[PDB]
RNA sequence: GUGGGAGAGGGUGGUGGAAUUCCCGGAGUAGCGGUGAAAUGCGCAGAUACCGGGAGGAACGCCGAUGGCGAAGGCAGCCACCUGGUCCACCCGUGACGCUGAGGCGCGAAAGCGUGGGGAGCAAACCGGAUUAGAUACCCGGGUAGUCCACGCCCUAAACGAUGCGCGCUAGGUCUCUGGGUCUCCUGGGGGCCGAAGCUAACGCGUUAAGCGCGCCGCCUGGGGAGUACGGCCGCAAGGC
């Protein structure tokens, strides 16, 4: 049990239907590995520095979660597994550090 | 890694008196735990030598303690390696 | 793993056998075998049309499922892993939940008690079969159909596998075990994973006998013949080829490209192999 | 122009504000030296460590062509 | 140790080459221990154009 | 045809080449130190980069090309008198960029560049 | 023991972009490339230059540095998982449990070797072009092992700080890393710099000693012959000891 925060980038051009289904499959999968969601920051589109998937546009999710340490890596695989899923980056949760 | 509960779990078991933290038997059991975890780490990744170094240092330390314990009190020595399943 | 031997006899020195590790059950499904008529490379004319062939150990053919879309959506459990004398690969015994039992060429990594299934809806995991169009590009896959519903042809041999390089129109683009890049119909079933027993290749037969057990009779060089027999036949006392090296039939055997010029099959062949 | 001054109190661990972050790269997208950032030692580490993470996210550029 | 004065030269070579408006950043000696100085010398002087100005 | 457009300057130690393109990027006319009179080390020069850049413009204009963005790739000793002479060739020169490719530490370079 | 830190320390899996090369398409035309200068080479069978698409391998720019980590070799995109070392603070526990270390065991850059992958760039050998009295080189166009991964060997080095390890005692000045504190400073651990006393054949060293002492180990005893031969041991070999 540790705190990580998944960052998913998805297809800009998706259906409300499509998007919802992926958003489902995602939420689904998290449950299966023993991920408990502690938050979501979902930002919708928010365009880019460089063309991920030949696509200046990109669709950003994010979730601050709590799951068993052992199971995280597999999750990220199961996440990338989707044709629409484009980036997945998981990062362990580290209390902020500030300047001036 | 080992987590504080796991440690304390063992620690309280081997402690000679209720408040004991140091105390050769404890120190031993502490190493012993971190050793056997390292062993299994190594059985898996055989390609990690730097970590292996540690193991030898740990095993080394445990040895010294064990000896000292033995030449002060036998019994209490012979009690520990059997209780820890050690020295083959 | 390639079990080795001490050299308590001359042949035993270099000979090596497989480890048979992944093998769970040792006699075949009685319902699933059927005899293999042994030809000795003779055709229905009586005539040897393939040389140096015969005398192997007797074998029962294990019936294999190269279709798999035969049963869509019905999951199955892995009952065992068995030795198949007819192929380089190992076979997996499936118990379908239907109650019907089939064999498949065992992919690498299958364990007993795993669940596999076939079809579009199928999770992408070792042992499952989907039409190629639903298979993520860059995944490695085996036992691939070539034309739709015609049965698996590509990548069945031990250790082999083929990879999906991209889709184009109704087709996906595969890199076959040879390195050929072939367009292959999207509708074609492939099954995710690589063929198991990738250690096959490391086997050193070790003695003439072993070859003879596998049904392979001694091969004789054209050099060792006479002109009646072979292009390289004759010449007094041990000679060099003495013309471009040829087959007994007289066609050139180094480099001479033999695939048919006009084959409709091209136009799906993107790039020849390999290196 | 020391950018730690020109900005305000902010956490560089959080990698997601392309706003706060993008001030910290030269026009070309090159991470800015310690001279230009006005950052300390320990800071500059935690900075680019997170910058890269974001560049991977797609929020910051890896590069840009120089304009005249 | 009497080679200090090679370092000393090359750092200085850089410390003055740094303060220009414009300097090179590309123009050292091909030895190692001498190049640390000139480039890290071109550093302070390129950093001191920042501080103040 | 085209009037608005852009021009690529290839600037190296042995030569300078320019290509005038359409805005889609497909070229219209090209020229280089070689193209006018010059063989060997002479193409490597500033003076040469000039006539090349001009002959590039003067052939752009025969198609009606007027406005062009200069994108610059290289480091030449002809690089300077090339961009220069473009502005001075009678072209709108609507902007100036330097695109030079550099690796992020890619493949190891030849012995010369080590 | 409790409580905190920093870091390219190690192992496994995954993933991001830049660039090189090759392939498909477009657009386009008389040279490109290359040097001190040239030539070989490439190019009207349409190259170089530019645009779009794909394949693939290797290395990770800016951060970045005299910085950091490790016992050494050595370690660098980012992600997670497994794991070593090490620092601080509390003065809580144990009570001399210590230092060193012949043999032993493990690690050990590159090159090299075995098996099977992989191969873009580079590049011993090799082929050309030049330069040259010649040029079995320096420079140029090519190019194979190798360079990469797995597994197993090899065990060497300017493997260097040419400085074995542990503890104690002997001016300070300076900037730098990283902890802690009544935070200008004070204080613990690393990294450099100038230097008291002292050392030294000189150079130089100097609280990171080459000072002043104690413990232990390792090595030296004129140059060449020679790290050769013989023997032994090790290695598939090369070859090591
Ligand atoms: Mg057996
Ligand atoms: Mg019957
Ligand atoms: Mg018949
Ligand atoms: Mg008949
Ligand atoms: Mg073989
Ligand atoms: Mg044969
Ligand atoms: Mg024969
Ligand atoms: Mg005969
Ligand atoms: Mg004949
Ligand atoms: Mg006959
Ligand atoms: Mg005849
Ligand atoms: Mg003959
Ligand atoms: Mg003869
Ligand atoms: Mg004969
Ligand atoms: Mg024929
Ligand atoms: Mg050039
Ligand atoms: Mg770490
Ligand atoms: Mg990797
Ligand atoms: Mg690319
Ligand atoms: Mg083309
Ligand atoms: Mg291109
Ligand atoms: Mg070193
Ligand atoms: Mg750690
Ligand atoms: Mg006390
Ligand atoms: Mg080695
Ligand atoms: Mg090597
Ligand atoms: Mg090899
Ligand atoms: Mg030559
Ligand atoms: Mg060469
Ligand atoms: Mg070359
Ligand atoms: Mg060889
Ligand atoms: Mg040194
Ligand atoms: Mg040291
Ligand atoms: Mg020595
Ligand atoms: Mg020693
Ligand atoms: Mg001594
Ligand atoms: Mg503090
Ligand atoms: Mg200190
Ligand atoms: Mg250190
Ligand atoms: Mg000094
Ligand atoms: Mg001395
Ligand atoms: Mg001697
Ligand atoms: Mg030697
Ligand atoms: Mg001998």
PDB file of N, CA and C in Angstrom, chain A residues 50-86:
ATOM      1  N   UNK A  50       4.664  18.613 -28.377  1.00  0.00           N
ATOM      2  CA  UNK A  50       5.028  17.830 -29.560  1.00  0.00           C
ATOM      3  C   UNK A  50       3.928  16.822 -29.886  1.00  0.00           C
ATOM      4  N   UNK A  51       3.838  16.398 -31.159  1.00  0.00           N
ATOM      5  CA  UNK A  51       2.746  15.521 -31.596  1.00  0.00           C
ATOM      6  C   UNK A  51       2.870  14.065 -31.126  1.00  0.00           C
ATOM      7  N   UNK A  52       2.411  13.794 -29.911  1.00  0.00           N
ATOM      8  CA  UNK A  52       2.127  12.424 -29.519  1.00  0.00           C
ATOM      9  C   UNK A  52       1.146  11.797 -30.513  1.00  0.00           C
ATOM     10  N   UNK A  53       1.493  10.612 -31.001  1.00  0.00           N
ATOM     11  CA  UNK A  53       0.679   9.870 -31.971  1.00  0.00           C
ATOM     12  C   UNK A  53       0.312  10.663 -33.244  1.00  0.00           C
ATOM     13  N   UNK A  54       1.250  11.493 -33.702  1.00  0.00           N
ATOM     14  CA  UNK A  54       1.068  12.348 -34.884  1.00  0.00           C
ATOM     15  C   UNK A  54      -0.084  13.337 -34.695  1.00  0.00           C
ATOM     16  N   UNK A  55      -0.326  13.689 -33.431  1.00  0.00           N
ATOM     17  CA  UNK A  55      -1.517  14.428 -32.996  1.00  0.00           C
ATOM     18  C   UNK A  55      -1.235  15.595 -32.003  1.00  0.00           C
ATOM     19  N   UNK A  56      -1.131  16.853 -32.489  1.00  0.00           N
ATOM     20  CA  UNK A  56      -0.873  17.990 -31.581  1.00  0.00           C
ATOM     21  C   UNK A  56      -1.798  18.023 -30.383  1.00  0.00           C
ATOM     22  N   UNK A  57      -3.057  17.637 -30.595  1.00  0.00           N
ATOM     23  CA  UNK A  57      -4.061  17.516 -29.521  1.00  0.00           C
ATOM     24  C   UNK A  57      -3.831  16.263 -28.654  1.00  0.00           C
ATOM     25  N   UNK A  58      -4.072  16.352 -27.348  1.00  0.00           N
ATOM     26  CA  UNK A  58      -4.050  15.144 -26.539  1.00  0.00           C
ATOM     27  C   UNK A  58      -4.973  15.227 -25.336  1.00  0.00           C
ATOM     28  N   UNK A  59      -5.461  14.085 -24.833  1.00  0.00           N
ATOM     29  CA  UNK A  59      -6.516  14.055 -23.814  1.00  0.00           C
ATOM     30  C   UNK A  59      -6.026  13.548 -22.473  1.00  0.00           C
ATOM     31  N   UNK A  60      -5.948  14.419 -21.474  1.00  0.00           N
ATOM     32  CA  UNK A  60      -5.312  14.051 -20.212  1.00  0.00           C
ATOM     33  C   UNK A  60      -6.222  13.667 -19.064  1.00  0.00           C
ATOM     34  N   UNK A  61      -6.015  12.476 -18.521  1.00  0.00           N
ATOM     35  CA  UNK A  61      -6.578  12.131 -17.223  1.00  0.00           C
ATOM     36  C   UNK A  61      -5.515  12.274 -16.157  1.00  0.00           C
ATOM     37  N   UNK A  62      -5.861  11.872 -14.929  1.00  0.00           N
ATOM     38  CA  UNK A  62      -4.903  11.683 -13.838  1.00  0.00           C
ATOM     39  C   UNK A  62      -5.636  11.220 -12.601  1.00  0.00           C
ATOM     40  N   UNK A  63      -4.995  10.382 -11.787  1.00  0.00           N
ATOM     41  CA  UNK A  63      -5.609   9.805 -10.585  1.00  0.00           C
ATOM     42  C   UNK A  63      -4.592   9.610  -9.464  1.00  0.00           C
ATOM     43  N   UNK A  64      -4.859  10.109  -8.267  1.00  0.00           N
ATOM     44  CA  UNK A  64      -3.950   9.900  -7.157  1.00  0.00           C
ATOM     45  C   UNK A  64      -4.484   8.664  -6.475  1.00  0.00           C
ATOM     46  N   UNK A  65      -3.710   7.583  -6.430  1.00  0.00           N
ATOM     47  CA  UNK A  65      -4.277   6.336  -5.918  1.00  0.00           C
ATOM     48  C   UNK A  65      -3.536   5.712  -4.734  1.00  0.00           C
ATOM     49  N   UNK A  66      -4.089   4.624  -4.206  1.00  0.00           N
ATOM     50  CA  UNK A  66      -3.359   3.793  -3.257  1.00  0.00           C
ATOM     51  C   UNK A  66      -3.497   2.310  -3.608  1.00  0.00           C
ATOM     52  N   UNK A  67      -2.361   1.688  -3.933  1.00  0.00           N
ATOM     53  CA  UNK A  67      -2.333   0.275  -4.312  1.00  0.00           C
ATOM     54  C   UNK A  67      -1.135  -0.457  -3.710  1.00  0.00           C
ATOM     55  N   UNK A  68      -1.180  -1.807  -3.686  1.00  0.00           N
ATOM     56  CA  UNK A  68      -0.025  -2.556  -3.183  1.00  0.00           C
ATOM     57  C   UNK A  68       1.171  -2.342  -4.112  1.00  0.00           C
ATOM     58  N   UNK A  69       2.337  -2.122  -3.504  1.00  0.00           N
ATOM     59  CA  UNK A  69       3.582  -1.836  -4.222  1.00  0.00           C
ATOM     60  C   UNK A  69       3.841  -2.847  -5.345  1.00  0.00           C
ATOM     61  N   UNK A  70       3.724  -4.127  -5.010  1.00  0.00           N
ATOM     62  CA  UNK A  70       4.025  -5.205  -5.948  1.00  0.00           C
ATOM     63  C   UNK A  70       3.261  -5.148  -7.269  1.00  0.00           C
ATOM     64  N   UNK A  71       2.036  -4.632  -7.259  1.00  0.00           N
ATOM     65  CA  UNK A  71       1.147  -4.793  -8.421  1.00  0.00           C
ATOM     66  C   UNK A  71       1.161  -3.676  -9.483  1.00  0.00           C
ATOM     67  N   UNK A  72       1.840  -2.571  -9.185  1.00  0.00           N
ATOM     68  CA  UNK A  72       1.808  -1.363 -10.016  1.00  0.00           C
ATOM     69  C   UNK A  72       2.280  -1.494 -11.474  1.00  0.00           C
ATOM     70  N   UNK A  73       3.399  -2.170 -11.666  1.00  0.00           N
ATOM     71  CA  UNK A  73       3.985  -2.231 -12.985  1.00  0.00           C
ATOM     72  C   UNK A  73       3.088  -2.910 -14.007  1.00  0.00           C
ATOM     73  N   UNK A  74       2.532  -4.058 -13.617  1.00  0.00           N
ATOM     74  CA  UNK A  74       1.561  -4.806 -14.428  1.00  0.00           C
ATOM     75  C   UNK A  74       0.399  -3.909 -14.845  1.00  0.00           C
ATOM     76  N   UNK A  75      -0.079  -3.117 -13.893  1.00  0.00           N
ATOM     77  CA  UNK A  75      -1.164  -2.192 -14.136  1.00  0.00           C
ATOM     78  C   UNK A  75      -0.858  -1.323 -15.339  1.00  0.00           C
ATOM     79  N   UNK A  76       0.304  -0.671 -15.298  1.00  0.00           N
ATOM     80  CA  UNK A  76       0.728   0.240 -16.360  1.00  0.00           C
ATOM     81  C   UNK A  76       0.792  -0.445 -17.715  1.00  0.00           C
ATOM     82  N   UNK A  77       1.104  -1.738 -17.701  1.00  0.00           N
ATOM     83  CA  UNK A  77       1.060  -2.546 -18.918  1.00  0.00           C
ATOM     84  C   UNK A  77      -0.382  -2.655 -19.395  1.00  0.00           C
ATOM     85  N   UNK A  78      -1.232  -3.165 -18.500  1.00  0.00           N
ATOM     86  CA  UNK A  78      -2.661  -3.329 -18.757  1.00  0.00           C
ATOM     87  C   UNK A  78      -3.289  -2.015 -19.197  1.00  0.00           C
ATOM     88  N   UNK A  79      -2.698  -0.888 -18.800  1.00  0.00           N
ATOM     89  CA  UNK A  79      -3.202   0.411 -19.213  1.00  0.00           C
ATOM     90  C   UNK A  79      -2.822   0.730 -20.648  1.00  0.00           C
ATOM     91  N   UNK A  80      -1.564   0.459 -20.998  1.00  0.00           N
ATOM     92  CA  UNK A  80      -1.038   0.803 -22.332  1.00  0.00           C
ATOM     93  C   UNK A  80      -1.652  -0.113 -23.391  1.00  0.00           C
ATOM     94  N   UNK A  81      -2.265  -1.185 -22.904  1.00  0.00           N
ATOM     95  CA  UNK A  81      -2.760  -2.269 -23.740  1.00  0.00           C
ATOM     96  C   UNK A  81      -3.765  -1.781 -24.780  1.00  0.00           C
ATOM     97  N   UNK A  82      -4.352  -0.611 -24.524  1.00  0.00           N
ATOM     98  CA  UNK A  82      -5.460  -0.080 -25.316  1.00  0.00           C
ATOM     99  C   UNK A  82      -4.957   0.687 -26.529  1.00  0.00           C
ATOM    100  N   UNK A  83      -5.637   0.516 -27.658  1.00  0.00           N
ATOM    101  CA  UNK A  83      -5.218   1.170 -28.900  1.00  0.00           C
ATOM    102  C   UNK A  83      -5.250   2.688 -28.733  1.00  0.00           C
ATOM    103  N   UNK A  84      -6.286   3.202 -28.074  1.00  0.00           N
ATOM    104  CA  UNK A  84      -6.405   4.643 -27.839  1.00  0.00           C
ATOM    105  C   UNK A  84      -5.431   5.201 -26.785  1.00  0.00           C
ATOM    106  N   UNK A  85      -5.200   4.457 -25.698  1.00  0.00           N
ATOM    107  CA  UNK A  85      -4.251   4.889 -24.662  1.00  0.00           C
ATOM    108  C   UNK A  85      -2.903   5.207 -25.312  1.00  0.00           C
ATOM    109  N   UNK A  86      -2.353   6.366 -24.961  1.00  0.00           N
ATOM    110  CA  UNK A  86      -1.151   6.895 -25.626  1.00  0.00           C
ATOM    111  C   UNK A  86       0.084   7.069 -24.728  1.00  0.00           C
TER     112      UNK A  86
END
